Structure formats: structure tokens, C-alpha cells
Amino acid sequence: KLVRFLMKLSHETVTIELKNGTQVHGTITGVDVSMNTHLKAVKMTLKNREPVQLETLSIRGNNIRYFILPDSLPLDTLLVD
Amino acid sequence: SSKMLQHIDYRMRCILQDGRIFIGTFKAFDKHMNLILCDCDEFRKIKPKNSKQAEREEKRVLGLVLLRGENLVSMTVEGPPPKDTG
Amino acid sequence: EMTPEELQKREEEEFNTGPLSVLTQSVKNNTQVLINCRNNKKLLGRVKAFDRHCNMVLENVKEMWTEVKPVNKDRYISKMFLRGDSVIVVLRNPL
Amino acid sequence: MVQPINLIFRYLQNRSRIQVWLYEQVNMRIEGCIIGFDEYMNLVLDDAEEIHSKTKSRKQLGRIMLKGDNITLLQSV
Amino acid sequence: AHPPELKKFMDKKLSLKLNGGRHVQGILRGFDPFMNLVIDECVEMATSGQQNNIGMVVIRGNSIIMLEALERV
Amino acid sequence: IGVPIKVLHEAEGHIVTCETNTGEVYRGKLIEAEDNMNCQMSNITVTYRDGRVAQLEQVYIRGSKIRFLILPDMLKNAPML
Amino acid sequence: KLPHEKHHNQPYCGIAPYIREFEDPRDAPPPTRAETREERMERKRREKIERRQQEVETELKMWDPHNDPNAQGDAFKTLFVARVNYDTTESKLRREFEVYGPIKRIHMVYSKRSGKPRGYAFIEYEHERDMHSAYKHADGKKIDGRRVLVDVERGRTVKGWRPRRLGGGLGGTRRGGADVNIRHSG
RNA sequence: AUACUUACCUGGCAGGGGAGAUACCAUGAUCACGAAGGUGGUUUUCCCAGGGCGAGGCUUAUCCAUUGCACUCCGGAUGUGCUGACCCCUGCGAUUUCCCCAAAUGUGGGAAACUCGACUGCAUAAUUUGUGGUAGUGGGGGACUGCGUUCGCGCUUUCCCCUG
């Protein structure tokens, strides 16, 4: 599987886009097998809305569109498992 | 899975796929993410088609609500739980 | 599945010879690929890993889309993680 | 008690032109003689005709297949 | 894989709601765990007032939204 | 089973509200509840997206096609809660 | 609004206007195809297999199985017994295998360097008929509390036969886990 | 109360941190001394995978004493919220049997046995949540068309701007 790699990105910063065009930038703290991720000290930006900083946010996996990971991530080393 | 256990009974705001925001007392959950909210109120953002007016908010009281996880996008803590102390 | 044993390797042969082999040869030869997603936007970039769920690990991607006169908009992402459900079509470099 | 599986098998043996509705599409419909079906509800037709309510044009397709998830309602002849 | 308790609506005239704002009306004869229903004396009930009866038909549970019994069971 | 499912099973026989993915909201007495969220109601009041209402006598709704449900607030005193 | 009543002002378009890939001669980096802890293991796994296989050819040319001073007597008469308890006295091995017939000579192999008992011996009967009587009966015998197997020695009879170290032999007491039962005997 | 034959009523399979290095143990390997590997141990580095020890260190009040002559941080104790090296187990809540240490009915160790948990893998991307028909595809200020009109507006056709 591949979701195990997603659960290893705790405490790192990424930018996830949602199926409704919403963007969310924050630090990861925990992920599940259903792709649901919990981000702490996060900032959300709904479509045609103003950004808001949230100290926590638990998101479901179905409504996720894609993620944006850092530039220095070790893919070759992190994909070994 | 303490990430979710730690938040039981807190006043969390659930984000719906249609853009609504359900703010209620998060009571319990499950593997499917089906939540139970107490004293929930529904908000929705309506676009102004008349002129450049402030976004229109239409509150709606519901009480006890059961949200299906499939329809839940995300959830955050709006504020601490209702304090029972004077 | 047809092979309910836990030692079944059906997924293995599938990615090697099945329709999902387009991504294997892409990561093997490090070839680019264009993906059409449910966002009405097209993502052109390389792949580094994937699974049965059609979730690819992309890098050096370039997003492209159009709004409305029709105006085009594009940006770049050096590392991202694409989901499978939101995908519509995939197209490798036809060269 | 007649079930959909047994009823679909009857329509197949009868080779009647069964019409099918599309998922999320009310304006588009398909009709043809069913040849077979699987547990996934996918249906194959020998001579399909795509008819629209607005246009009323029947586009000939021939031997084709249709996804079960796209099916909405079955109709005889 | 527990099936739905639709024994009450068996052999009763119902009106079902579909996904694309479509509705039908017929007498139920059988169901399945996936809510695949076979209703007879069914009418199309298009957007217009026109009515078209075809009789026996089948409906996929994936598209059934709500089903009301006009005969109050 | 799940705790939300148990809160639903015990809610059988009382007035509950149910909203579907098509936007309709159904409020009436609950007859039968199942683990898969399949709910049977009687003498319900439906609300369409436009706002118009209608009258029904006996209704059944699939569980997967429900957005959320509203149950009596008194259920909060359940022993599990 | 609803998914069915939503007015799609810009529905999903094709990809025909978005073909801007790189030219063919602009090939991908050849050195960007490798993985760690996946090939170095296979590389080491191939050498140990080949190294032994190459070492096998050298031993066959130097050592001759048939031309063995220890081996003596007719090959069809001699017998082979293995899985024998190390405490088995020479007289105990004679008196237990003499029931099937007289033993002309008996040879118990020992470790060349350690001198310990190997656990298998060669029994040479006076008559070829006496051996065959033991082939069926000796197999499965119990000597000193440990079951023993018995088969005609193929070191000089069967064409293309060789022992464990040369890739041949029989018995899978140390083969793939849970693939060879210990109860079953040769 | 025990065993035997039949009918009826209840029930989802695989498992027990993972990846490298093991010269040494077991498997005492079916061919005249031998395997390698593998399987089951023991030894040995780690993503640290969760815990136990809280020494040391960080924030701020309460109490006590000090009138002190320093220029190498530092008076003693309690409370709030944190961190934490080194050292230990590779992880079970419950039950059953054998042997042994023993302050000998308790406190523990070395063995398994098959029993529950919603711990994981596959049926789980094929209609009921864990792999989409909920796409996000706009709104507004000026000039700029037409139809109906209650002159507020519904639909409809254009250019430049602010907004996401």
C-alpha cells in the first residue's frame, strides 16, 4: 500500500487542496488509512472567502483533491516501504 | 487514535461538502466518522446578486444532529465545551 | 478476490502487464505524463510511485487550467501528491 | 417472488429491446437487445440506439456495453 | 449483508424518487439487500404532466433516493 | 456496532428528521432503523430545495443517500453518553 | 445548489489543446533508475549461487566418486544407512542389519577434520539378494531410539547422482519451512 | 452425570513491532569430510513503533531569610504547563496446565493451549460511508442591447476595472 507513507509526514508542512477548491496549509499531526489527516496550527482558505488560521482541523479523506509536499522530501528513501 | 479521542465533548464546527458549517457539541464518532452534535446550528454563505453587500448569514437551530461521515469534509474546535461551573 | 489467500500476488502482475503499467514504465524511464483531473485542470509532471488506488507521487509538475474571454492560468509545483478518485484521464508523452 | 436477476434473465432470453436510463442524465436514454449481464449490473446490447428527449435523434451504435453504475431505470420495449 | 425491511411495502402502490429529479410510481413485488426493486404498473412521470405506463420495470438501489407509499402500507 | 448507530436504533419510534443528498429534508415519526442507516418513517413533512412542501403517509429512505439526521435532544441522557 | 441543477458554465474540456511534452531525443537521465536494499541483496544472492556453482565444477574434476578407497565391493550389493545415532556401536550396527543377511564389510564414515561420527554408514552384504531384502524392511527401522532410513547407495549406481554439497541428494529436513514433514521418511 | 445417532437454535478467514548484519546454537541435511540458503533461536545497528525510570533543564506566583562589595551562570521548599539523556520490554487486557526461585497458600520466572476485543491484511476502489456525478467552473462598479413590465425587476447581448 501507499497510505502508510502519508502517515509518516507528521510535523511537516504541506498544502492540500480540496474537491471544492478549498486550500489548507498547515502542519500534519496524524493520518489514518482512510486518508483523513489532522493538521494543527493550520490556515484554511475557502473559495471566494477570506483566509482563517485554525489551531486544529481534522479532515476526511474523500473530500481531498491533492497534496503539495516540500521540495526537500526524500522520496527515494521514503518509498522503500 | 488519541487524535480523535482527545476531542470528545468539545464544541467543534463540522464543514459540509456543500459549503455549510455545522457547529455543535461533538459527542461521539466512529470509524466512518459519523458524528453526533448537540445544539447544532447551520450556517450557509449566499452570494449577493443585488449589489456589493456583506455576505448573508442564515442561522438555523437543529438541536441534536447525526452527520454521516461521507458528507463531512473537516472539523475544528470553535471553542471549549460549555463550562458547567459558575 | 479470486485469490482469497493472503499470499496472493494478483496486484503485482496487474501493474506489470495490466492497464496500470502506464505508470510503471513512466517511473521506470522517468518519463513525463499529463493527467486530467476532476478540477477541469491538467497536470503535467513526472511520477515516482503509485499503487492500486491510482495515487501517484509527482514532482516538477505544472498545473494548467482556463477560466471564463477564455484566459489560461498555469503554475508550478516541484513535489505534490495526487489522488486517484479525482483523476479522469492520463496521457504519457506520445514520443 | 420475482427478483431483478431472474427478471433480467427473462428479458435476455426474450431478446426484447430494453430501454435504460442514465445516471445523472434525464435527457439521454439507450435502448437495445440485451445479450448478457454480470453481478456488477453491466449490460451489453447487440444494437444500441441513443435517443434524446430534446433532439429525438436515434444514434446507431451497434454491439456495445454499458456500465451498471450509469443505469437508472429499465423499461420494456 | 443484512437486507432492508421492505416487507411492509410489498404489493403496495409506492412513489419512488430518483437521482436526477425523476420520479416513478408502481406496485412493489420484490427487493434485494442492495435495494434493487421490481415494480409493476409503473408510470414514467416525466417533468411534464404526460403519463406513460409500461408496467413491469426494475430500479437500481444506487439511484433510489426516497420511496413513499401512497397506500399508507 | 458503532455508537452513532446505537444512538439511532434507540431513537426508533420517535420523531426524527432526515436530509438527503438531493436536498430534501424529511421530518416525521421514525418506524424502523437499521445498522446501515436505512430508516422508515410515517406521516413525514418533506422540504424541497425550492421551499415547497408536500404530504406523505408512509415513507422509507435509503441510508447511504442521507446527508444527516436530527434526533430528539433528550437522547443525550443515554447511558453510553 | 444541487448536482443535477448546477449550471455548468465551463464543463470538463478535452486535452487536445494541452499537448506540450518534451521532444523525443530529450531522453530521460539513464542513471536515474535504481533502488536501495533491493538490488545489492540480489547481487550478493547471485554471486553466492554462482560462486558455489563454479566451485562445483572444480571439485568434480579433482575428486572421483567411483575411484574412492573407502568405497569397496560391488555397488549393487552395498547398502547405505543414514540418520544413525552417533552412539551406535559398530557391533550394534552389525547385529541390527545382519538380520537381513550376512555383512561382508561395514564402513562408518567419520568427519575428516573433526573426527566426529557423520551419522551414516555403508553396509556390504555377502549376496546381492540379501541387500534387497533390507531395502524394504530396513527403511523405517528404529535404532537407539532414533528412526533410521535405508536406501541402496546411488553414489556409484545411479547416473547423474551427487550429494547435497553438489546440489543433489534426497530428503528435505532443511528445505523451505513448512514444506517437508519430519514424520515422513525416505 | 458420561458416550453414541437424528432434528432444531447461534457464528467472517490469516496472523502477533519491521528493515539490515549474525563468525555462534538447533534443524545433529540421503552417498564415503561438508552444502549454501531457508526455517526457529542467540548476537548486533536502526525508521524509533509505543511505553516505564524523571536525573538534568525552561515559565510564573506563595512562604522564609538576607542591608549583602560583586565583576566564571546558581539562596531553600510547594504549586501551574512543558521538555527530557542514559537505562529497561519488544506489546496484550482476562482464563487454563507443567516445572522451578521463594520472605514457601502470596510475591515471580521458563513453556504452550485454544478462547474476547473492532489491532491489522485480504471480501474493502464494483450500489450502504474507508477512492466521487457534492467539480471550484463566480460576484460586484462604470459604459453597453433587446423581450415582458408593477419601472423595483426576470431573461437576454457587449468592453474596461475591483474581488477570489
From TrEMBL, chain B:
- The membrane-spanning stretches of this chain are none
Q: Does the keyword Transcription apply?
A: no
**Per the annotation, which location comes first and is thus the protein's main one?**
nucleus
Q: Which UniProt keywords apply?
A: Nucleus, Repeat, Ribonucleoprotein, RNA-binding
One of the record's GO cellular component terms:
U2 snRNP
**Which compartment or compartments is the protein found in?**
Nucleus
Query: Can you provide one Gene Ontology molecular function annotated for this UniProt record?
Result: histone pre-mRNA DCP binding
Which GO BP terms sit in this record? RNA splicing
Show where the Sm domain sits. 1-81
Is the Ribonucleoprotein keyword given for this protein?
yes
The record's similarity note reads: Belongs to the snRNP SmB/SmN family.
Q: What is this protein called?
A: Small nuclear ribonucleoprotein-associated protein
What is the primary gene name for this protein? Answer: SNRPB
Full-sequence portion shown in this chain:
6 to 91 of 231
